[PDB]
Symmetry: C2
Subunit: 133 residues, 2 copies
């Protein structure tokens, strides 16, 4: 009955969008365990992009999030069939391709992005109080 | 046995510092109910200071925080003896004076600020990547 759900990501400057994704992943089924993977400083900066907080910082913050049941930190850069097996993962939850194989395997669950709620969006709102001229 | 704890604040651009305060308030006793009061856009801007997010935004985010059991939104600008009675509050948790009377009443519990972990501190870290010259 309990369904094990896995979501990975950077979770840099955690905001409501991350939280709503995590909420969504948690509530995919009646009874779940949500496992969250936190990608490393190094594999992120290299393959993905710039990151403000250290792995330890990003990892610490996620402990405060209601929906998060387990944290893997650092997580493998790439999910594999072996990892899903090792960690008993029924579904990987992510937004809508390194996920195509999870879809083909029937082990993918889409969650939805939330727009305009990021940490940087809030700073932009602060800056908009100052007119160009 | 269950101890009812009350913490109020703006909770603008919620960050790890808020979270650690909330954690601390939650864990003051073995069994607690943590009630969190979210101060209004209007009474904050007036009596306190500038605020980025609306009451609804600040309130929504707190729902994602593990430690938070109940939310009062908007909360009364000022705690009163009557409010503590109405909401069965045993202790108000806050950092270390509109709290002196709670101390005198033996209904105050200090929590600790966390420095350097605020939303704005993270933006400052971003900006430091750009040299003045």
């Amino acid at each position: 009955k309990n369904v094990v759900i896995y979501a990975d990501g950077v979770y840099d400057m955690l905001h409501l969008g991350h939280m709503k994704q995590l909420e969504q992943a948690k509530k995919l089924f009646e009874n779940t365990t949500l496992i969250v993977g936190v990608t490393s400083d190094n594999e992120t900066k290299l393959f993905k992009g710039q990151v403000v907080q250290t792995l330890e910082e990003r990892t610490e913050t996620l402990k405060h999030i209601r929906w998060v049941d387990e944290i893997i930190s650092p997580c493998p850069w790439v999910v594999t069939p072996e990892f899903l097996e090792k960690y008993k993962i029924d579904y990987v939850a992510h937004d809508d391709d390194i996920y195509a194989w999870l879809k083909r395997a029937g082990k993918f669950k889409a969650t939805q992005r939330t727009e305009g709620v990021s940490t940087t969006d809030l700073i932009v709102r602060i800056l908009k109080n100052y007119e160009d001229y």
